[PDB]
């Protein structure tokens, strides 16, 4: 009973941990060249939590 319940708990949470892990680095790459210019003309692409 234990031997099932602990393995199902750990296969679920790392995938939760996986899912958040790569979504942010997309938000990083989708954002980051806009950070670099001397000019703050970010377009209306706010679905991605713009600064």
């Amino acid at each position: 009973t234990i031997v099932v319940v602990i393995r199902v708990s750990v296969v679920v949470l790392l995938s939760f941990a996986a899912s958040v892990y790569m979504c942010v680095v997309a938000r990083t790459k989708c954002l980051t060249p806009y950070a670099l210019t001397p000019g703050a003309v970010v377009p209306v692409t706010i679905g991605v939590l713009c600064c």
Partner: protein
Amino acid sequence: RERMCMKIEHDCIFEVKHEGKVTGYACLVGDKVMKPAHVPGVIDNADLARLSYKKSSKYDLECAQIPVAMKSDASKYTHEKPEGHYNWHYGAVQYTGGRFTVPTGVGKPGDSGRPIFDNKGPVVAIVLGGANEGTRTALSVVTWNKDMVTKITPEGTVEW
């Protein structure tokens, strides 16, 4: 050709240090301070090395934001660039076809961080390293759109 340029780098150039030995350079442009992250080291000033930095090795650049004290000491800049003569720390550079040129070997390793200008005053772009040519050299520069930054890197170069 040098009578307009010379005052500018005295206002706008710091360089990097590592083990009491300069290797690179650093600029201060617009609103954000600039460093080409290729070279290791620390900037040669007391306070602004205490700053936040945002790094992407995809471009090998590095910026931060200038604190409000010496914010009014940076140059002007634009993106409009027709072909023609332009200028830099060791002379005059020609540009066309998306291709920058200057004659042979007047640049060395240990020289990244040199901004380049126009005639009428704003700063334009910033250099990285060199490439062999025969006669008139190839460059390695990162530059700007109306909206975006961009690298161009022609074949057969060496990263200074």
